[PDB]
């Protein structure tokens, strides 16, 4: 078998970093297997013709922005907007928004790496607009607002928005970019889920550009994706860099079809598994660990993209340890649970076929 | 009437940085009034120095070798820095860089003390690596800058005083704390939030620790540095310290008060800091029932995270109300949320008054 091979994840972290993130809906992976199986028009336009103009008016249609680009993750498309917009140059950003994700990106790295200089302005917990203001300078490239997806900070703390800073910014001739990250297309409010800061918001408020994950909110593919204004996103393609980082045509064709799944918002929370995994009402999981060792209240995590803290009610079986978890490490289709509280817990929010799983235990 | 007229604090935060922050205890007002009455022996050794014994109290609390004590915890930090790390590079995590109040920012306090500010790992991310990795020969400190109004949650990584003091032994470069709000005792016993004590970080090799005295102290306004002999009498012979150097009222209030932490059993009720911080909710919802009443939280104060932690019960009653309390010679202030106006009787001792006021 090989090391690729599928895993139910009972963690209770539904977009776990490590275990692929987002699964993918089944329109696209009827899209993938339709890109893999037969040619298609990668870079060839029917009526020579880019590679991701279908996605581009996709995202326009969706979030508003007058152009997008794709490459390969968001780590490649912050380094690309920094190396394409703001080469040789400064960049302001907030103290409190130097974000590390995963343990590989970290804001100042990709900066020394994009060639920028990073301007760091006010402190970690309080942001003032006057510290944005006295840094820019006939150096400034831009001001880069990084959204902290993996993080917050509570107390006396004090952020600029976006819409100030994209004030100030015109008011200074200074462009603003964003760093979005989670990407998270629809409200997530409306679902009850706590609410994250959406493109569409970000381009309507005046954003220049803004970058976003596939894998996270998104539901898609790996994949990062900048959407902005048409002379952002022409700087972006034509830069050395973009030839390394363009994306492939499985991944092209999984966004194409992740993205026709919220022309259709309604049966957005069916279609994608996300959504569908994120939205799933107690209850049911309460009966579904009920029919298939004690039943109890325990707290699933959203995963990547959405702060760490637990916020969603479920139901888990537990096994009241070390040597279990192995054991069920060697089955052919591996069961990772959680050791919580001394006990080893199976959270049942991410169990979608009770059929194939109940083979294995 | 003067612009300090007394207020009776019914917003729920008992540590208010603008109302005074800490109430002194009785015995911090009987010793004040002694030595404001009279002349005491502030550089006079029956010539010995301004806070000797008080040194030799905070060593006996804490454990430190010697201590200094300065007009307030800026001082301190701004002393510390100028007197031990001037024109050096001071490596301080990306994610403790604080601002405190609006007046106190860690990055212009180390621009203010003449020393250079290198930030290491990130905001929510701090790895032992990113401390070694800036360490060079014109590196002076490592400083660990305690969050005391503010805490990252979510994906996070911060390097204890313990890993950080072992590094900089390997890399014979000090380690300094700025603690901040300088809880002299485990709140935890109190079913309040632990706070880091400076005993632990003095026990833990920290060179100097420095923390305020009117924060989770219950003390006067002061900056107390307590750490290595050697540091304290770099600090002590600055010549910063005669402009920071502590009246002798703050040194009386300060003794008077850290006499208290030697009589821990009474320590809840004879420090009105703790007392109003370990005041049970039965008692504030008797007390609100007998003067709607309905349950609501409050806030430690300075010092500590700033959330509605502490359960309590609260009189509610808008606008034109309030500007009309604040007209009071006692004025009563109180909180404006869902449309409401809320006093919370968490921090209300005098019932007899404020009944009096507000009828």
């Not at 970000?202 to 998104?218: H, N, Q, T, W």
């Not at 048409?230 to 064709?253: C, G, N, V, W, Y």
């Not at 194409?256 to 994608?272: C, D, G, I, N, Q």
């Not at 999981?285 to 009610?313: E, N, T, W, Y």
């Amino acid at each position: 078998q090989s090391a690729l091979r599928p895993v139910i994840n009972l963690t209770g972290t539904v977009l776990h970093t490590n275990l692929g993130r987002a699964l993918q809906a089944e329109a696209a992976v009827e899209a993938v297997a339709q890109a893999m199986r037969s040619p298609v028009t990668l870079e060839y336009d029917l009526d020579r013709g880019h590679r991701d103009r279908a996605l581009a008016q996709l995202l326009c249609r969706i979030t508003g922005a007058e152009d997008a680009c794709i490459v390969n993750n968001n780590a490649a498309a912050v380094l690309l907007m920094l190396a394409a917009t703001a080469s040789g140059k400064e960049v302001v950003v907030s103290r409190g928004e130097l974000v590390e994700i995963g343990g590989a990106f970290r804001i100042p790295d990709v900066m020394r790496q994009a060639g920028c200089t990073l301007h760091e302005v006010g402190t970690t917990n309080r942001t003032h607009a006057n510290d944005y203001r006295q840094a820019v300078n006939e150096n400034t490239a831009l001001l880069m607002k990084v959204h902290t997806s993996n993080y917050s900070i509570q107390g006396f703390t004090k952020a600029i928005d976006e819409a100030e800073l994209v004030a100030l910014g015109k008011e200074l001739d200074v462009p603003v970019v964003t760093d979005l990250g989670s990407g998270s297309l629809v409200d997530l409010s409306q679902y009850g889920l706590p609410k994250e800061p959406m493109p569409q918001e970000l381009i309507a408020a005046g954003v220049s550009l803004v970058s976003f994950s596939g894998d996270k909110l998104l539901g898609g593919p790996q994949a990062g994706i900048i959407v902005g204004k048409k002379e952002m996103i022409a700087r972006l393609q034509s830069h050395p860099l973009k030839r390394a980082l363009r994306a492939d045509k499985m991944t092209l064709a999984a966004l194409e079809a992740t993205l026709r799944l919220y022309l259709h918002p309604e049966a957005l929370s069916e279609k994608l598994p996300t959504l569908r995994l994120l939205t799933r009402s107690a209850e049911v999981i309460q009966i579904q660990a009920q029919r298939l060792v004690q039943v109890m209240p325990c707290l699933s995590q959203i995963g990547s993209g959405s702060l760490p803290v637990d916020r969603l009610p479920s139901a888990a079986l537990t096994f009241t340890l070390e040597s279990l978890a192995a054991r069920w490490r060697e089955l052919p289709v591996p069961v990772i649970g959680r050791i919580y509280d001394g006990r080893l817990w199976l959270d049942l929010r991410c169990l979608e076929d009770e059929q194939r799983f109940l083979e294995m235990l």
